[PDB]
Assembly symmetry: D2
Homo-oligomer: 121 residues x 4
């Protein structure tokens, strides 16, 4: 299992010790407060009112927690995933990333505390 | 395992099929948007800016997801609990509740979708 | 989870720390060598050649590992149970017992090492 | 998870759908009756009285259930493994094999029914 912090201004994202393999079932739980710029902070679901201006993940709100698995595209994580299986041909190290527009992570603040574990299969 | 919705205006809370027994390890993941009154909506961590005016759970923000286990006091759930063990002498059916002041649930809106499962022990 | 030894000459059986509750999924793995009398020893499946002369469990061979859950009748365990769910209205402490005829445990020898854990549910 | 039969006369062994990956925790439960030649049959622990005459696994009795993981040497399985982690650098498909001397599987009989699952990690 892995636990650690995902910083909102970390554009490269946070690499974890979790390698997703074919057939794996995982659970993620994310908590905390972060901002993509404004003084206000939002949870792992991000800001439902902010327009998408080039987010690294178009299937999640700005300020949401997302992930990449290996060299997959971004996958929404939000508050977490419950006993979750990946799409086919998706595998590799899990990296957690704050959802923001590339080149605009500089003014971000806060972080998400995240737990990841593999479940029974 | 249990999955279902928890309505923000449900003052009595949502009873689940999960009976927490001594020694049990559980995982909860909660998602969605709700409000304790304002047009704005918040995630299961609630509104970090709103003052506590008599919340059923003083250890969580207004609009947060909380729970009771049997006849326990309220316990913060927020975005969820990862492989979580209860305090001693805590057991019984799990009821999920929106965190608001008693008597003020009438103007709430939205809901949280919640997964609960028992883990390896 | 529980791990411990189950002595073949223990007529009362070995009480474990495991309380089976409704809905629980459990895994048991048993290993080792024991005898109901003869110099030969058998594994947790017991002696397939020996006639049943009043075994505490008629659904298992003499010398097999069995269990009671609460005040249930004996249930065959043998080499173990994989992600196993009990019949309805069966619950309580798990006690492991060597399968022999009541009053004839005195000449038994050896033991089984057993692991019991609760599984994801 | 995987369930299936392992034939005693199958010298090449039974390939499973389980790929053991680094970090994986697995549970195996094996049951049934088989023989390496004699009319008598033995459980997954094999025959404790029979001398080793060139067994594919020298750390288990003749007639015992063993396995290979990828290109590993044979690993004793016996009645099963409980929440088990492999040695370092061991990974790949799990193949279950009856422990006998190479070239002598022809007169074997019976089979073991085996369950394999990945556990919480
Ligand atoms: O959409 C992503 C961008 O949102 C801006 O925040 C805004 C706040 C109000 C109006 C427009 C952008 C941030 O300042 C910028 O860094 C980037 O994150
Ligand atoms: O604190 C809990 C209460 O918050 C009020 O909303 C307010 C918003 C701003 C200032 C005071 C109350 C809600 O209108 C009321 O129903 C109750 O939930
Ligand atoms: O059936 C259970 C009994 O089996 C006897 O062993 C026998 C071995 C061969 C034939 C008859 C009894 C044991 O001596 C006795 O203690 C009891 O366990
Ligand atoms: O040790 C492995 C071998 O055991 C023999 O069975 C014997 C039984 C008693 C004495 C010698 C061999 C089998 O006949 C042969 O096929 C092979 O499995
Ligand atoms: Ca920004
Ligand atoms: Ca309200
Ligand atoms: Ca006896
Ligand atoms: Ca043979």
């Amino acid at each position: 299992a892995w636990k650690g912090e995902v910083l909102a201004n970390n554009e490269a994202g946070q690499v974890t010790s979790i390698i997703y393999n074919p057939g794996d079932v995982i659970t993620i739980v994310a908590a905390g407060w972060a901002s993509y710029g404004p003084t206000q902070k939002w949870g792992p679901q991000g800001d439902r009112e902010h327009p998408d201006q080039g987010l690294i993940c178009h299937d999640a709100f700005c300020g949401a927690l997302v992930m990449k698995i290996g060299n997959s595209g971004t996958i929404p994580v939000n508050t977490g995933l419950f006993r979750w299986v990946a799409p086919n041909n998706v595998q590799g190290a899990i990296t957690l990333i704050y959802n923001d527009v590339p080149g605009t992570y500089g003014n971000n603040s806060g972080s998400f505390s995240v737990n990841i574990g593999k479940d029974q299969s």
